[PDB]
Design a protein around this ligand. Structure first.
Ligand SMILES: Nc1ncnc2c1ncn2[C@@H]1O[C@H](CO)[C@@H](O)[C@H]1OP(=O)(O)O
Ligand SMILES: [Ca+2]
Length: 104
């Protein structure tokens, strides 16, 4: 069973934790990776019900289980705040353009 399902992608809590930790470290270090410079700010204009406060940052979570190191980021993202709190898991999958929908 999946803890988070992003379209057809299946993620376990452990997967989320690993991705989050990588993203947060880069954030602390004032560093970014990839052509789209992740991690980057995330604006909650869609109003997802995140129980944690902003600012929020987004970092790619890969279907493969590997930690994002540049290259194609896919459609899935983990969202964390300034305090390294998990805000949620979201995806471009099933959303128009560059918009997002929440992973279930
Ligand atoms: N796989 C994907 N599907 C849809 N939009 C994507 C994408 N990968 C990157 N983007 C978006 O492409 C634009 C450049 C950004 O708005 C970026 O949004 P993101 O960085 O929030 O994911
Ligand atoms: Ca996995």
């Amino acid at each position: 069973a999946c803890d988070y399902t992003c379209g057809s992608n299946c993620y376990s809590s452990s997967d989320v934790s690993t991705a989050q930790a990588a993203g947060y470290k880069l954030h602390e270090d004032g560093e970014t990776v990839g052509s789209n410079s992740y991690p980057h700010k995330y604006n909650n204009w869609e109003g997802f019900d995140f129980s944690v406060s902003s600012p929020y940052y987004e970092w790619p979570i890969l279907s493969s289980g590997d930690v994002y190191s540049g290259g194609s980021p896919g459609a899935d993202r983990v969202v964390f705040n300034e305090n390294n709190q998990l805000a949620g898991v979201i995806t471009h999958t099933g959303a128009s353009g560059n918009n997002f929908v929440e992973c279930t």
